[PDB]
Curated annotation (Swiss-Prot), chain A:
NCBIfam families: rplX_bact. It comes from Mycobacterium tuberculosis (strain ATCC 25618 / H37Rv). One of its GO terms (cellular component) is cytosolic large ribosomal subunit. One of its GO terms (molecular function) is structural constituent of ribosome. Belongs to the universal ribosomal protein uL24 family. The gene is rplX. This is Large ribosomal subunit protein uL24. One of two assembly initiator proteins, it binds directly to the 5'-end of the 23S rRNA, where it nucleates assembly of the 50S subunit. One of the proteins that surrounds the polypeptide exit tunnel on the outside of the subunit.
Swiss-Prot record, chain B:
GO terms for biological process: translation. GO terms for cellular component: large ribosomal subunit. One of its GO terms (molecular function) is structural constituent of ribosome. Belongs to the bacterial ribosomal protein bL32 family. It comes from Mycobacterium tuberculosis (strain ATCC 25618 / H37Rv). InterPro entries: Ribosomal_bL32, Ribosomal_zn-bd. Residues 1-21 are annotated as: Disordered. Keywords: Ribonucleoprotein, Ribosomal protein. The keyword RNA-binding does not apply. Residues 1-18 have a biased composition (Basic residues). The keyword Ribosomal protein applies. This is Large ribosomal subunit protein bL32.
From Swiss-Prot, chain C:
It holds the Pfam family Ribosomal_L34. GO terms for cellular component: ribonucleoprotein complex; ribosome. HAMAP family: Ribosomal_bL34 (MF_00391). PROSITE patterns: RIBOSOMAL_L34 (PS00784). This is Large ribosomal subunit protein bL34. Belongs to the bacterial ribosomal protein bL34 family. PANTHER family: LARGE RIBOSOMAL SUBUNIT PROTEIN BL34M, MITOCHONDRIAL RIBOSOMAL PROTEIN 34 FAMILY MEMBER. NCBIfam families: rpmH_bact. The lineage of its organism: Bacteria, Bacillati, Actinomycetota, Actinomycetes, Mycobacteriales. GO terms for molecular function: structural constituent of ribosome. The keyword Ribosomal protein applies. InterPro entries: Ribosomal_bL34, Ribosomal_bL34_CS. It comes from Mycobacterium tuberculosis (strain ATCC 25618 / H37Rv).
Swiss-Prot record, chain D:
This is Large ribosomal subunit protein uL22. This protein binds specifically to 23S rRNA; its binding is stimulated by other ribosomal proteins, e.g. L4, L17, and L20. It is important during the early stages of 50S assembly. It makes multiple contacts with different domains of the 23S rRNA in the assembled 50S subunit and ribosome. The globular domain of the protein is located near the polypeptide exit tunnel on the outside of the subunit, while an extended beta-hairpin is found that lines the wall of the exit tunnel in the center of the 70S ribosome. GO terms for biological process: translation. Part of the 50S ribosomal subunit. It comes from the Bacteria. Belongs to the universal ribosomal protein uL22 family. The keyword Protein transport does not apply. Was identified as a high-confidence drug target. One of its GO terms (molecular function) is structural constituent of ribosome. GO terms for cellular component: cytosolic large ribosomal subunit; peptidoglycan-based cell wall. The gene is rplV.
Length: 90, 54, 44, 113
RNA sequence: CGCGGCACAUCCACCUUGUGGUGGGUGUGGGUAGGGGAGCGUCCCUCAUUCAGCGAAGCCACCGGGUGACCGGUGGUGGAGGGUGGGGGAGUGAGAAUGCAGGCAUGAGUAGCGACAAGGCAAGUGAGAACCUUGCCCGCCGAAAGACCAAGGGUUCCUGG
RNA sequence: GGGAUGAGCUGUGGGUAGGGGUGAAAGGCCAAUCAAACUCCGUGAUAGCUGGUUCUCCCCGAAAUGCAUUUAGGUGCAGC
RNA sequence: GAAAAGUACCCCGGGAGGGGAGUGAAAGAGUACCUGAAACCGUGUGCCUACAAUCCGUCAGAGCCUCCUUUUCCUCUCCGGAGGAGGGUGGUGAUGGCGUGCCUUUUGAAGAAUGAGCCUGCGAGUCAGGGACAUGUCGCAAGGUUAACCCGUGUGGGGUA
């Protein structure tokens, strides 16, 4: 994925469209993530979050608005660094 | 001797309706201060505590 | 022979008549085992 | 029209024709009158048929708040369920089919003076 | 024969005067084997167009239409594909093969429930006992219906469920 | 009911194979099958024979005779 | 089912199964689960049926039941249609007449000749080829046409043997 555990995300589709939360756990072989506060499930005892598909969230770029995310060879270690589109940071 | 033809819906239902259970008569019993209902041939044993009412 | 049936089991005679080391002695038997590997039988 | 209660009994391992012989005794009778007809009926299907009238009388009193002395068996029938198939070996290498029939039993008791 | 609808052949009139159309006479129209002509419905593709989560298909019901195969409307159910027109292609239409597969009736709550040693009571256990437990009684085998191996079987043995 | 110290019965292991075996001989038997076993392939064998062959309407509409036939319940040609 | 959010808790029951709650857009999706056809099996209800001989239909036809409508009346009259009279749908059918199943195969079958218990699904003139004969139709025309092959992203262009 391009979405990791510590990332905060914006829900862009679904019932909770517009909610900003952060990923609690990532499930790469299902393309699903757990975001805190979204699609709360009233499960019968014996409410927590359900996982949503990763195509319904976008990573927030630490300057407000969400973004598609890109890569950048840092030229000093040889490992790609996950950088933001729309004004190009981290 | 096998049957020659299958019976119609009218002919199988007329015979089959005569397979029916005969219900029994029930009379009244008061034992230990409790009103029950038993068949009349069990009336002596109901008055002697020999019948379980479940 | 009243009451006697065709299959009287004996495990040493199943192996000496139908077993692996008899199949592998003649060409007819090697072609049977090669054609049961080819079909996919678990038992040869 | 009248306040009622429904209890169903699914996958009862009683043949549907044998169930219907013993519900003909209690159709339209009151619940007190039907539980003791089914108490003294010698047939074996009277066991399961009595428990569904009893669980219909319980749902009327508990879940509906209805008077037990005014309940009557308004509607009872026995449908059928799935049938398991078996084999009974017969003479000279014949094999015949044996059927295990099941029943669905519905009781609608209603409250009326 | 009378009155009204349809179809086919032929004749007479015309409108690009047979590729045809319209109108008017007369004649004809039972039909198996079989020959010729013209169509309905299902599916897929192409072009054009038009519907559809404000509910496609499929299904069910009611009301209607056509000369037939069949069609349309409206509603219920349902949850994602259809309708029309010019063309193209068919795994294109079943009631019969002692056809094949699956589901279900009829016989019918009927035959049967596997030897001619034979069970009974008391107590127990349990939601439930003719059949399980324990005790006593009665009966049957006793060159086996007792006790051991072999072949064969393969965990069926024991304990707790 | 026959034999029941014998041309006896039986156990275990072995041998003989399909126009071949084996047979105190019945065409018996050779894995519930035998006047030539079973299985797979040639193979979708072939059948002048029996059966089946699925929506519609419009128009016309037979024949069961002749001749020949290893032919007579088939087919060629004529007739319709 | 989008997601297991697969029904906490209470009641009846030994359980199984259910009812109420609750989840879900929908349990008219509840691990027997998408849609849910027919055979077949019940329950409820309208009409008919216990003096009649029935290929089970068809035409004539009385009554009963149901739901809409024409004329004054309950004129509470905007009401309501309240009941009856007339008509009209829908269901049923006392009674009268007529009436020998379907298929196959035959000179001829309702035949006591054959096949079919029932429903659903499947199950039979196809394809190849510069083949053969005959035709409809299109292109070129005293000529018509290429085959293998070659070049192209293809259905296009070459290719006279
Ligand atoms: Mg998405
Ligand atoms: Mg046997
Ligand atoms: Mg005529
Ligand atoms: Mg005609
Ligand atoms: Mg014809
Ligand atoms: Mg709707
Ligand atoms: Mg389709
Ligand atoms: Mg229709
Ligand atoms: Mg519709
Ligand atoms: Mg629809
Ligand atoms: Mg369609
Ligand atoms: Mg088209
Ligand atoms: Mg076509
Ligand atoms: Mg077909
Ligand atoms: Mg069919
Ligand atoms: Mg059939
Ligand atoms: Mg069958
Ligand atoms: Mg009988
Ligand atoms: Mg008996
Ligand atoms: Mg026994
Ligand atoms: Mg006891
Ligand atoms: Mg003795
Ligand atoms: Mg044991
Ligand atoms: Mg044990
Ligand atoms: Mg003697
Ligand atoms: Mg003797
Ligand atoms: Mg002797
Ligand atoms: Mg021989
Ligand atoms: Mg001889
Ligand atoms: Mg034999
Ligand atoms: Mg031979
Ligand atoms: Mg060949
Ligand atoms: Mg053949
Ligand atoms: Mg004619
Ligand atoms: Mg002849
Ligand atoms: Mg000829
Ligand atoms: Mg529950
Ligand atoms: Mg509920
Ligand atoms: Mg809710
Ligand atoms: Mg739905
Ligand atoms: Mg089901
Ligand atoms: Mg379903
Ligand atoms: Mg009468
Ligand atoms: Mg007569
Ligand atoms: Mg004859
Ligand atoms: Mg004929
Ligand atoms: Mg017949
Ligand atoms: Mg007959
Ligand atoms: Mg028959």
């Amino acid at each position: 994925m391009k979405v990791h555990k510590g990332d905060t995300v914006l829900v862009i589709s679904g019932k909770d469209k517009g909610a900003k939360g952060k990923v609690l756990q990532a499930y790469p072989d299902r393309n699903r993530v757990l975001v805190e506060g979204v699609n709360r499930i009233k499960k019968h005892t014996a409410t927590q979050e359900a996982p949503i598909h990763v195509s319904n969230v976008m990573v927030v770029d630490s300057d407000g608005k969400p973004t598609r995310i890109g890569y950048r060879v840092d030229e000093e270690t040889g490992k790609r660094v996950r950088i933001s589109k729309r004004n190009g940071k981290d | 001797a096998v049957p020659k033809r299958r019976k119609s819906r009218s002919n199988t239902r007329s015979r089959r309706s005569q397979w029916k259970a005969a219900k029994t008569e029930l009379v009244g019993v008061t034992v230990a201060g409790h009103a029950h209902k038993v068949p009349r041939r069990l009336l002596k044993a109901a008055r002697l505590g020999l019948i379980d009412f479940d | 022979t009243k009451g006697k049936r065709t299959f009287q089991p004996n495990n040493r005679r199943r192996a000496r008549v139908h077993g692996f080391r008899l199949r592998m002695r003649t060409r007819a038997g090697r072609s049977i085992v090669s054609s049961r590997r080819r079909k996919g039988r678990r038992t040869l | 029209e009248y306040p009622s209660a429904v209890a169903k009994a699914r996958f009862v391992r009683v043949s549907p024709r044998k169930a219907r012989r013993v519900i003909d005794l209690v159709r339209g009778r009151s619940v007190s009158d039907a539980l003791d007809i089914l108490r003294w009926a010698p047939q074996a299907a009277s066991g399961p048929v009595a428990k569904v009238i009893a669980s219909a009388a319980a749902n009327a009193q508990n879940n509906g708040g209805l008077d037990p002395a005014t309940l009557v068996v308004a509607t009872v029938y026995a449908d059928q369920g799935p049938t398991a198939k078996r084999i009974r070996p017969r003479a000279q290498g014949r094999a015949f089919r044996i059927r295990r029939r099941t029943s669905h039993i519905t009781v609608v008791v209603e409250s009326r003076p």
